[PDB]
């Protein structure tokens, strides 16, 4: 159970490399007992450990214009509302009362949806670009 | 140029289209919406029907009205403005006050 | 190559046709200048069978059974009629029906690599009365589409479809949504000829997304619908993979699947392959690059007559025929005449009179598209509607675009089939009321005075 | 805004939709059902046809009515409310009490 | 509720459907038949056309009538019973005595 003992069984199974022993002993600590570890081909000569915290998933912004930190090339929203639509968004008809209510609140909004079609996306692009509501989809 | 609609015809111009303030807030994008509202520009001499005297149409110039913008409604270019031509029947209602 | 033995004008068209001794193809063939015509027509028959190029041998020279023969030839009318041994068209193992890869290989493909044939447009052919039932043959076709749509198996008429607006660049799920919207309208769709695995909208996601859109549209309309996946690929096993995937993707509606093959760029190998594992599904022939052959910009390859008449032979459940209202002349490659040739099993072509017992019907697929109101005129000229639409704004400049207009022009036939024409079903069906309202470009004159009986204020 | 329909036209607003009490008990989901009933908001001055005097329409403001909700009925936005506009012939019957 | 059909309209309810006594004996299954016979529940004030006086309709409440159960009849839900609304011209005959 101790970090040292785990680092040995790591080292032995690795065929006597202390680096992986330390690295795996570090990973096991930082991710916690319920955490998950994976291994993949790197690029540099060194081994490296990346730890992700909270929730992460492989979906990006639906348009570049949502980029509000173009120095980073990224979107960040603070205290955002989150709308969870288990559907296509196709018409702003669907959004109007929500966007007004979010606009009433003045907080930014993140949309996570099955899809956001050009009409809705374009309308969000105009309203976000012109600063009426901060929105990402 | 002024124009005289030759009885039952009415000439109007439509109000603003796709008002950029949906719910007073969201600057809506285009939705191919067209306003059913217009201003009465010219009114014909009256109604020729029934061999009665030509009774006038009840709308007058400067009336603001709701009209059915159907395929029967034509449109024309005058003084480079767009205008619309319709029967009295194609007008649905008058915008009062 | 060679003309000796390949000239066999002594063959009687009666025993060839009614005796069924040969498949008989009528070509409007013109040689290049200075070549002997009969030699070219006979030499073209060699390309239309054994090849027989420079030399043929079987350890002891000669080869003489495989030859397809000219049996009528006439230089000044550009006529080249070639009779093909039935042994040329080897039987497919799935059904015992001849591989149409051979037929194209021997008519409008590798045989056309002959250069001194300037063109050899086949205007008509015949296929032996009996062995016709053992031509590749469309084990699914309009008649089976009727069955899965719940229509009667006789004169189930127009299976309505579209070319998705606005054609290319529409991403898979917008494309699937345009299919959904269209399927809130009508019945049938295809992928576009570039919309294979090309990166703008690959097949798998599109067909997965389009299949969902079909089920959604079905659930929201209460009627079955169909999609034609572009299986056309450079690898026949990727074609099979696309075909299997679409069937597996539509699953409970796998019988709803159509298989779009851009058969001219795909070749008849792709067609023959898409007919093989998929006999219970609709092979949709499509006409990429067809300007090289069928269009008036060329005299080579197929006429639209044989293009689609061979789609019967292909087991292409349907084929892009051109445009349903065909100009200049009829019988000679008219889509209207083709719609007879494909949908009525007893018809006259411009050189051959043929029955189609046992082998089953083929479906004309219409590009460009009549409005919902002109089509009951085509139906009245065709005496049926047993075709598929696959067109854009010409049929789908409806007030609801691809949507309600695509329901409307199905019911436009149904009224014609009731002998009422479309006026009645526009009184019955709102989409047709909106269709008379959308298509006054024909509506107010092809079927008289709807405006008072149909709809209310301004229709 | 108040509106005056320009003879023979009638304007209403629809009653509640998809009332959630089928048999008075079960909360229905959506079945795309729509109520054929509405309340009369304004009534035109009368009927102009046949050279006769413009006789009044029989409905009056505050009437509740059954109407044919067919393609002749149009719909419009007022005070951000929806409203409906129809001929008298589209109203089928008057609902008392 | 009581309802007054508003001129030319008549309200009926259909008689029994698919009488289970074919030839008075054989119990027919469902055979898509619908009775052309119904009982008149309410009758409109009359016919307004042609500028004549509003003469009454010829049917009266409690008449039993054969009607064209065709595309012209329309139907509504009242007191949870179904009823049908049609023109007088939908009614083909009175089965009297």
Curated annotation (Swiss-Prot), chain A:
One of its GO terms (molecular function) is isomerase activity. GO terms for cellular component: cytosol; GroEL-GroES complex; membrane. The keyword Flavoprotein does not apply. Keywords: Acetylation, ATP-binding, Chaperone, Cytoplasm, Isomerase, Nucleotide-binding. One of its GO terms (biological process) is protein refolding. Its main location: cytoplasm. It is found in: Cytoplasm. Phosphorylated reversibly during heat shock. Can be UMPylated on a tyrosine residue by SelO/YdiU, probably under stress conditions. The keyword Nucleotide-binding applies. Together with its co-chaperonin GroES, plays an essential role in assisting protein folding. The GroEL-GroES system forms a nano-cage that allows encapsulation of the non-native substrate proteins and provides a physical environment optimized to promote and accelerate protein folding, probably by preventing aggregation and by entropically destabilizing folding intermediates. Belongs to the chaperonin (HSP60) family. Each subunit is composed of an apical domain that binds non-folded proteins and GroES, an intermediate domain and an equatorial domain that binds ATP and is involved in inter-ring interactions. Forms a large central channel that appears to traverse the entire length of the cylinder with no obstruction. The central channel of GroEL functions as two cavities, one in each ring, that are separated from each other by the crystallographically disordered 23-amino-acid C-terminal segments of the seven subunits. The entry and exit of polypeptide seem to be restricted to the apical end of each ring. This is Chaperonin GroEL. It comes from Escherichia coli (strain K12). The chain holds residues 139 to 275 of 548 of the full protein.
From Swiss-Prot, chains B, D, E:
GO terms for molecular function: ATP binding; identical protein binding; metal ion binding; protein folding chaperone; protein-folding chaperone binding; unfolded protein binding. Its main location: cytoplasm. The modification N6-succinyllysine is found at residue 34. Pfam families: Cpn10. GO terms for cellular component: cytosol; GroEL-GroES complex. GO terms for biological process: chaperone cofactor-dependent protein refolding; protein folding; response to heat; virion assembly. It is found in: Cytoplasm. Gene3D superfamilies: GroES chaperonin. InterPro entries: Chaperonin_GroES (IPR020818), Chaperonin_GroES_sf (IPR037124), Chaprnonin_Cpn10_CS (IPR018369), GroES-like_sf (IPR011032). Keywords: Chaperone, Cytoplasm. Activity of the GroEL-GroES chaperonin complex requires Mg-ATP. It comes from the Bacteria. Belongs to the GroES chaperonin family. NCBIfam families: PRK00364.1-1 (NF001526), PRK00364.1-2 (NF001527), PRK00364.2-2 (NF001531). PANTHER family: 10 KDA HEAT SHOCK PROTEIN, CO-CHAPERONIN GROES. Heptamer of 7 subunits arranged in a ring. Interacts with the chaperonin GroEL. Can form asymmetrical complexes, composed of one GroEL and one GroES, and symmetrical complexes, formed between one GroEL and two GroES oligomers. The asymmetrical complex is the functional unit. It was suggested that the symmetric heterooligomer may represent a transient intermediate in the chaperonin protein folding cycle. Another study shows that the symmetric heterooligomers are substantially populated only in the presence of proteins that cannot be folded by the chaperonin. This is Co-chaperonin GroES. It comes from Escherichia coli (strain K12). The lineage of its organism: Bacteria, Pseudomonadati, Pseudomonadota, Gammaproteobacteria, Enterobacterales.
Swiss-Prot record, chain C:
One of its GO terms (molecular function) is ribulose-bisphosphate carboxylase activity. Mg(2+) binds at residues 190, 192-193. Its EC number is 4.1.1.39. It catalyses: 2 (2R)-3-phosphoglycerate + 2 H(+) = D-ribulose 1,5-bisphosphate + CO2 + H2O; D-ribulose 1,5-bisphosphate + O2 = 2-phosphoglycolate + (2R)-3-phosphoglycerate + 2 H(+). The keyword Secreted does not apply. PANTHER family: RIBULOSE BISPHOSPHATE CARBOXYLASE, RIBULOSE BISPHOSPHATE CARBOXYLASE LARGE CHAIN. Belongs to the RuBisCO large chain family. Type II subfamily. This is Ribulose bisphosphate carboxylase. The lineage of its organism: Bacteria, Pseudomonadati, Pseudomonadota, Alphaproteobacteria, Rhodospirillales. The gene is cbbM.
